[PDB]
Design a protein around this ligand. Structure first.
Ligand SMILES: Cc1ccccc1CNc1nnnn1C
Length: 460
């Protein structure tokens, strides 16, 4: 029975509005409703992995698991295995997988982050799950960010706290946050970004929604504008939105948006918004294709509609050779030529690199680089041809060309990372000097760039 080179992943996010669900929620898992929807001919084909994020979830873990499993069993006639479940307050994540994957999944981690301080600590934050699926690392984050149209900068701060402090994936990747630890990272939830238009325009917005004319609304969506301005979710992708705003509905219908200020809302307006979102970030040149992104039309217990997204995702096998794992394969090597880091820092410490990869027995520290002044004020750290030759555990090109090298540039004075990035080994040629490039980030913000050339030797 061959190991897969692709899987499909279902991501759901639903703010349940503290109400129990209706008796039937199958439309959610079938990607049916509005937006980019799944073809009917696929309805009985199970996804490999289902990741369900809820917010304002009033159910126990047991109660929700029973509903989810019975829902999937009805669609697919498969009894899914529970990989992980984790709840912070009323924010929950459930991962379910086909039983045939049970012995492909390992290294399961869960964590949560509570956002805010005093007043603002006690209901918002995030939960996450990570695991290995054969040779591929997968991370999943469900966040419930700060509410309210005038709090976009708080949401952005919530995002940075979650990616700094959520402890998932391989703890040996010490310089790297969750935005670098996984082959594929899915980040979803009630992100709570709003359509930034005047309150007076509420009825005009409703009109536009009834006409399925979303362009003049999406151009004011805070998440799209903040992402464009590099304020949040740097280097994440989102499918185009082609479904109506998923908040704020009158319960028990979808015919009415409930936007007007009420005592129950703290006298705040809730103009129709795309609060409920799915984004992802995958390592360079790894297959990932969004095959659905939409909202259900028939689940009406909450003031939000559920959102679904599904993905094809490339996966790799747990590779064994005669040599690695447990030794190097002298027929393999990775060389960096003429490499330099450009850093936004004002600091004047010396810097060194660390190379981390599961194709290495352990991470590799470089010598210090040579600091020069860039023309437009910046720090350029030159490595020349000084970088250590990396010795992969396996030389087979079917394995090595699918790997990645994480790079951290660290201060010699403090050993703190000033920037992290990632280089794919999925090269156009072996035994050939080829350009490489990654942006560098720290705490998920842009801090610089790393560029140079690579020369990869495989057994072929
Ligand atoms: C509503 C539902 C529930 C469980 C499984 C499938 C479906 C809809 N799919 C379907 N019905 N007839 N043909 N097809 C493709």
């Amino acid at each position: 029975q061959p190991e897969p080179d692709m899987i499909t992943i279902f991501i759901g996010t639903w703010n349940m509005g503290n109400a129990p669900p209706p008796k039937k929620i199958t439309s959610w898992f079938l990607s049916k409703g509005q937006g980019k929807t799944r073809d009917d001919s696929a309805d009985y084909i199970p996804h490999d992995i289902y990741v369900i994020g809820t917010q304002e979830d009033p159910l126990s873990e047991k109660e929700w698991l029973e509903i989810l499993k019975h829902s999937l069993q009805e669609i697919t006639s498969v009894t899914f295995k529970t990989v992980a479940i984790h709840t912070l307050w009323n924010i929950r994540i459930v991962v379910l997988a086909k039983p045939e994957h049970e012995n492909r999944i390992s290294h399961i981690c869960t964590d949560n982050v509570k956002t805010g301080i005093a007043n603002t600590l006690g209901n918002k934050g995030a939960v996450g799950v990570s695991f290995m699926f054969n040779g591929t690392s997968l991370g999943f984050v469900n966040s419930h960010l700060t509410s309210g149209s005038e709090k976009k900068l708080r949401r952005n701060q919530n995002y940075m706290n979650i990616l700094r402090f959520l402890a998932l994936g391989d703890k040996k990747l010490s310089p790297f946050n969750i935005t670098h630890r996984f082959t594929h990272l899915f980040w979803f939830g009630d992100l709570n970004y709003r359509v930034d238009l005047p309150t007076w325009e509420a009825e005009t917005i409703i009109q536009k929604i009834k006409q399925q004319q979303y362009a003049d609304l999406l151009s004011h969506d805070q998440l799209l504008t903040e992402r464009r301005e590099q304020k949040v979710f740097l280097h994440f992708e989102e499918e185009e939105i082609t479904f109506a705003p998923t908040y704020r509905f009158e319960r028990l219908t979808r015919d009415k948006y409930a936007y007007t200020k009420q005592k129950a809302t703290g006298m705040k307006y809730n103009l129709p918004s795309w609060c409920d979102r799915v984004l992802w970030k995958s390592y360079p040149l790894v297959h990932v294709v969004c095959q659905s992104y939409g909202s259900t039309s028939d689940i009406m217990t909450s003031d939000h509609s559920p959102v679904f997204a599904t993905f094809e995702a490339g996966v790799t096998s747990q590779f064994v050779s005669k040599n690695g794992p447990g030794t190097v394969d002298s027929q393999g090597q990775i060389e960096f030529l003429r490499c330099y880091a450009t850093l936004k820092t004002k600091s004047q410490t010396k810097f060194y690199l660390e190379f981390h990869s599961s194709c290495l027995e352990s991470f590799v520290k470089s010598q210090e680089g040579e600091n020069e002044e860039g023309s437009e004020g910046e720090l350029v750290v030159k490595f020349g041809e000084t970088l250590p030759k990396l010795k992969p555990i396996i030389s087979d090109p079917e394995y090595l060309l699918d790997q990645h090298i994480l790079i951290s540039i660290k201060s010699s004075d403090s050993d703190e990372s000033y920037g992290e990035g990632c280089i794919a080994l999925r090269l156009e040629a072996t035994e050939t000097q080829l350009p490489i490039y990654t942006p560098l980030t720290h705490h998920g913000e842009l801090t610089g760039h790393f560029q140079g050339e690579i020369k990869l030797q495989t057994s072929q």
